[PDB]
């Protein structure tokens, strides 16, 4: 009773914790009441309690600053003891920690402590450590004297004193600038997977010493450079308390024969002595490259030594080995056998949401101007990884620094806190840095939740329901795990696959003709296994195979070369599909404009069992399509969209879009010419009608109808 498990914070503020409301009702404390938290080693901290809709009934959410003051870690238990007797303070004395006040001078109170405490009414206790961010520096302070004891509320009428040399950090105190879970932006799912596998054997060693079954011995983190592979490994070690040993390929390979292998096995011995511990091996492909690709004795012997060291982990209790690589297929396959490194996690490239969170983390110490919009930046930074967003914030800061430092002119060993705190980074400084920055992962495939929703697709009301049923039924109640769309081009085949991914908040993986053709022409169809493996790692996701017959067309389509219906890639697709379960949360959607020439195997039971016909839209749907296409622009009241729909009887959705964009092209030109009118007028649509034509002939509709009648 009155005890909860320590969990991650949602509110980043250092003076507050969040409880689930039912526990506040049992403790009979209100939102905003001051409570004490009882931690390990007879230590306590004072904070304010609130509540939210996400905290578990049996957990307390507190950030790193509060956990460090209690000397507790995630997964521990603390007691909550309300203390309504807390009074307002009269005088407090707060001094900085030397580790964070180096190179900076000036009046720390006016810059940091004053706005931090002013009108905040934060609880304070003697011995507390708390962090105040600003001036592009993270400065933490320790409380050395409080006139009331042992804690109070710091009110606007409380005297705040700060005189004396910075305090040297104690050996039992950890720096708040060390990487933890709050420093990781996107890839929350991947971090959760690591938690499940790693935190338990490190937080509770006694659980696994009593049994003959070992926890996972190695985890392989892969993805482009700069995505957080090392950051996750360090954050987990720092949050659980396990000793972190850093190894990398170049450090071992740069050594001479004998010394190289000695250093590798010595690090493993040190981890055992310091167990529990995590051994992180960076550039695994450099320390353990495929042996069949090299003739050197050093490379082969190091691989053999690493293989035996991994096996020795059954004796080195509580040591977990993690490795980082670019691709699981760029390392010697022996490491990936049962045991050793038999768990793989795809870190990937952050999406627009993840990129925003990463920028918000980096700017924690930065003062941003009112015109700065990090969401807009995250949308523009396509192809960037966290390492590039870190450089982006640094470059934006340096540009802002130069602009004002030319006016500050402070040339000394330290820089005043006031002149740094007055510096703000503007939108022009981020845009400048964006123009100079170059993404490191631009050529890599970017997989994210699409922005196309059901309101963007005109007509097809029944197809929308069918897709929702195919995904919802196996979860609400052998259900099919894929559907093929057939029919005329430009009717929404791709949009349907995106819209269902959107509503499900699922990742959308787009496979287009050129990619299917590249695998065919280059005899690299093995990449299909990586596509399906990406779909599994990206789950929940929708794996969309567009232009399924693109290779058949490349081979002649209606004529044909050495092949016909089946090819290298579709057969690899069949291979992977037959190994995928309905419980993998991967929904496979295909699309073709020539369903008569696709390998019939793909439609056999257990594969793409569902087939949906997408005909040309009817009259009411064509109106809906025009309205959806024009939802982003001003349209005059004289525009009769129903009249246009009545004329465009044979037009596809793609053809109606051309009309809308042509009307936009004319409307925008008139506006530009007038400036050198503000809305799209009927005259612009009537002119567009003079050029727009239907792309789907009547004979092509008969071809699709006959196929639909074949299946019924």
């Amino acid at each position: 009773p009155n005890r909860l498990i320590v969990d991650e914070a949602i509110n980043e503020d250092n003076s507050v914790v969040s409880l689930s409301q039912p526990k506040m009702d049992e403790l009979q404390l209100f939102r905003g009441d001051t409570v004490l938290l009882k931690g390990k080693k007879r230590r306590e901290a004072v904070c304010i309690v609130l509540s939210d809709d996400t905290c578990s009934d049996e957990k307390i959410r507190m950030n790193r600053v509060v956990r460090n003051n209690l000397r507790v870690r995630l997964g521990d238990v603390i007691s909550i003891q309300p203390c309504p007797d807390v009074k307002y303070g009269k005088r407090i004395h707060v001094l900085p920690i030397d580790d964070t006040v180096e190179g900076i001078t000036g009046n720390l109170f006016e810059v940091y402590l004053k706005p931090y405490f002013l009108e905040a009414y934060r609880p304070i206790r003697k011995g507390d450590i708390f962090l105040v961010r600003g001036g592009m520096r993270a400065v933490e302070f320790k409380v050395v004297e409080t006139d009331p004891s042992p804690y109070c509320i710091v009110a606007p009428d409380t005297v705040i004193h700060c005189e004396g040399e910075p305090i040297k950090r104690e050996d039992e105190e950890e720096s708040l600038n060390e990487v933890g879970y709050d420093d990781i932006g996107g890839c929350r799912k991947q971090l959760a997977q690591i938690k499940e596998m790693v935190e338990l054997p490190l937080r509770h060693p006694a659980l696994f010493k009593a049994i003959g079954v070992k926890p996972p011995r190695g985890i392989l983190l892969y993805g482009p450079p700069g995505t957080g592979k090392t950051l996750i490994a360090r954050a987990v070690a720092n949050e659980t308390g396990a000793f972190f040993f850093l190894i990398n390929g170049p450090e071992i390979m740069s050594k001479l024969a004998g010394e190289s292998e000695s250093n590798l096995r010595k690090a493993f011995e040190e981890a055992e002595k310091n167990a529990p511990a995590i051994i992180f091996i960076d550039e695994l492909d450099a320390i353990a490259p495929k042996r069949e690709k090299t003739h050197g004795e050093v490379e082969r012997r190091i691989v053999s030594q690493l293989l035996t060291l991994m096996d020795g982990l059954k004796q080195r209790a509580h040591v977990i080995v993690m490795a980082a690589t670019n691709r699981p297929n760029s390392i010697d396959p022996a490491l990936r056998r049962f045991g050793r490194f038999d768990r793989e996690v795809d870190i990937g490239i952050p999406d627009a949401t993840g990129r925003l969170e990463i920028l918000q983390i980096h700017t924690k110490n930065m003062k941003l101007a009112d015109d700065v919009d990090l969401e807009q930046v995250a949308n523009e930074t396509h192809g960037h990884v966290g390492a590039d967003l870190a450089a982006l914030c640094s470059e934006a800061a340096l540009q802002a620094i130069r602009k004002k430092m030319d006016l500050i002119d402070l040339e000394d060993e330290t820089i005043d806190a006031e002149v740094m705190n007055s510096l703000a980074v503007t939108m022009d400084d981020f845009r400048w840095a964006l123009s100079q920055s170059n993404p490191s992962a631009l050529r890599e495939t970017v997989v994210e939740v699409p922005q196309v929703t059901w309101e963007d697709i005109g007509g097809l009301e029944d197809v929308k329901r069918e897709l929702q049923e195919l995904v919802q039924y196996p979860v609400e109640h052998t259900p099919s795990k894929g559907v093929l769309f057939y029919g005329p081009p430009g009717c929404g085949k791709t949009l349907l696959a995106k819209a269902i991914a959107n509503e499900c908040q699922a990742n959308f993986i787009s496979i287009k003709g050129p990619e299917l053709l590249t695998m065919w022409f280059g005899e690299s169809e093995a990449n299909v296994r990586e596509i399906f493996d990406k779909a599994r790692q990206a789950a929940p996701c929708v794996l969309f195979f567009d232009e399924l017959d693109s290779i058949a067309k490349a081979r002649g389509g209606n004529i044909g070369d050495g092949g016909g219906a089946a090819d290298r890639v579709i057969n690899q697709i069949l291979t992977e599909m037959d190994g995928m379960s309905t419980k993998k949360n991967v929904f496979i959607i295909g699309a073709t404009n020539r369903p008569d020439i696709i390998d019939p195997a793909i439609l056999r039971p257990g594969r793409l069992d569902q087939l949906i016909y997408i005909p040309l839209p009817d009259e009411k749907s064509r109106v809906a399509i025009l309205k959806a296409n024009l939802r982003k622009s001003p349209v005059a009241k004289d525009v009769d969209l129903e009249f246009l729909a009545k004329m465009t009887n044979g037009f596809s959705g793609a053809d109606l879009t051309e009309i809308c964009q042509r009307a936009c092209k004319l409307a925008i030109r008139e506006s530009i010419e007038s400036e050198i009118v503000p809305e799209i007028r009927r005259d612009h649509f009537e002119e567009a009608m003079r050029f727009a034509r239907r792309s789907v002939s009547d004979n092509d509709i008969r071809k699709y109808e006959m196929f639909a009648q074949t299946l019924q």
Partner: protein
């Protein structure tokens, strides 16, 4: 949460509010039948949109006879009329109001049928002085539902420093087998929930489970002099 009934002065809980007020209104008929039926029409009926239409239609019947008090065709209100049945007959207390302001319930021959129909017929005693019905019409239209007043229960408390003095057991921080298995199960379920491919309707069904717990609040104020002030809203 406590309330005061404005018709009796009784102290009630949140569930006892309608029971006491309804009983007080039904008893009030012994003092002022018109005021009691007016309270019943607004208080007993939960659908206030129908109450507004009911009292507006009743006001129109009264103004019709007020304009032409010499014509007998405005003295009788037909209980089987489509408008009366939908707006007035569907409410509790509207029949009591008609009787309270001088209408008798009688059966009159129909202008085109043998079967007598139900009418509220104004008596000559009240018809002679339209000023009585005009005042009763305004008393009905200006009325509101009767609800128990929320008791603020103003209290001040003095915290006792002794409540903050407690020492934990030495084995407090040692988690049990159930606490460790539960936490690892929640970790596996949290990873699974992120992995599940589901539609928005399935997502909302679970998220919506946290939305209905409270309709009252207790507020406290921390005062500079160390006093804790509390009240109910």
């Amino acid at each position: 949460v406590y309330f005061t009934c404005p018709l009796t002065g009784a102290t009630l809980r949140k569930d006892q509010r309608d029971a006491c007020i309804k009983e007080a209104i039904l008893l009030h008929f012994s003092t002022d039948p018109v005021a009691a039926s007016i309270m019943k029409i607004y208080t007993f009926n939960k659908d206030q949109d129908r109450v507004k239409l009911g009292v507006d239609t009743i006001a129109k019947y009264l103004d019709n006879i007020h304009l032409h008090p010499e014509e007998e065709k405005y003295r009788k209100i037909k209980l089987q009329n489509k408008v009366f049945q939908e707006r007035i007959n569907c409410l509790e207390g509207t029949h009591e109001f008609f009787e309270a302001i001088g209408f008798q319930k009688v059966l009159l021959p129909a202008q085109d049928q043998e079967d007598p129909e139900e009418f509220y017929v104004l008596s000559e005693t009240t018809l002679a002085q339209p000023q009585s019905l005009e005042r009763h019409k305004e008393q009905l239209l200006a009325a509101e539902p009767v609800r128990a007043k929320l008791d603020r229960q103003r209290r001040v408390f003095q915290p006792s420093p002794l409540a903050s003095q407690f020492e934990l057991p030495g084995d407090f921080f040692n988690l049990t087998a159930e606490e460790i298995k539960r936490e690892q199960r929640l970790r596996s379920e949290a990873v699974e929930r992120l992995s599940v491919l589901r539609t928005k309707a399935m997502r909302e069904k679970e998220e919506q489970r946290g939305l209905r717990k409270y309709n009252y609040t207790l507020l406290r104020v921390r005062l500079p002099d160390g006093c804790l002030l509390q009240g109910t809203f």
